[PDB]
Amino acid sequence: QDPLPQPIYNPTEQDIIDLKFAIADSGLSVSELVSVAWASASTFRGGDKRGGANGARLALMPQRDWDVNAAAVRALPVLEKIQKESGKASLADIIVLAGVVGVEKAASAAGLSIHVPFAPGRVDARQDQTDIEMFELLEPIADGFRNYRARLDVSTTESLLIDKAQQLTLTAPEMTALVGGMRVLGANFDGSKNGVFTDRVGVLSNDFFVNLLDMRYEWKATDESKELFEGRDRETGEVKFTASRADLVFGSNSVLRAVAEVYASSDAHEKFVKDFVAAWVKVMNLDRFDLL
């Protein structure tokens, strides 16, 4: 017996206000904030009752030591210290809240004060409620939201992104708003420039789409494996951007460019930000009221 029950929390509105203040002032960047929240939520699979942000299992084994999560796991200790210092909310709630602050900061930097809806109520799992063997199964072969791809395989990078979006129950418009925003917010798991079509990383703009759609660039594989692409300015021939298949599908799948061309420019900046926020929140809440 590890005797006492976990604390029961009932954050009030003002509790949440102060936890946002604490998180905003912690020196954590927009990239670190968005990565930790995404690493938490993104284990959800439709139909399985294991993944999702409830439980803060990112803080435990084995998710804490997954390669994909190394960036996310660098914010944890800051957030773990904030949670212990306040004891008004569970770390699971505070991880998701970090995502909220990070997205609100990104949009502010873009000139918009969006409110990002937050549902309180999550609890923390103990390691001895977190069967290590069962959770290893969910370690991702790929997360194209963070441009991660293990085990260059028989299966297609592009095909694994679709599978992951399907696991998350995302629409094509949601999956698209999410990839585009996560690129420019700096969510790539290893800081790669792939897909990062912007000179203002950490600002929630629609740059991914403006630039991906821009016909001034011509895209070519860097070799036979065809997993890495350079995009060159057609007049100079000078490489301007690089991309993986998970970036390029939004141009190169007629059907995904369709959804992709909506956001690709402008006065369109505010609708992309609203759809981003709706999608992000939807992912954050997949294990709230999951019917299956």
Swiss-Prot record:
Disruption phenotype: Cells are more sensitive to killing by nalidixic acid, the effect is mitigated by pretreatment with 2,2'-bipyridyl and thiourea, both of which inhibit hydroxyl radical accumulation.
The keyword Phosphoprotein is assigned to this record: no
One of the GO BP terms on file: response to oxidative stress
This protein's GO CC annotations: cytosol
Disulphide bond pairs: none
Induction (record text): By hydrogen peroxide.
Signal sequence residues: none
Presence of the UniProt keyword Metal-binding in the record: yes
Keywords: Heme, Hydrogen peroxide, Iron, Metal-binding, Oxidoreductase, Peroxidase
One of the record's GO molecular function terms: oxidoreductase activity
Post-translational modification remark: The N-terminus is blocked.
Self-association and partners: Homotetramer.
Function: Bifunctional enzyme with both catalase and broad-spectrum peroxidase activity. Also displays NADH oxidase, INH lyase and isonicotinoyl-NAD synthase activities.
Family: Belongs to the peroxidase family. Peroxidase/catalase subfamily.
Name of the protein in question: Catalase-peroxidase
Source organism per UniProt: Escherichia coli (strain K12)
Parent-protein start and end of this portion: 435 to 726 of 726
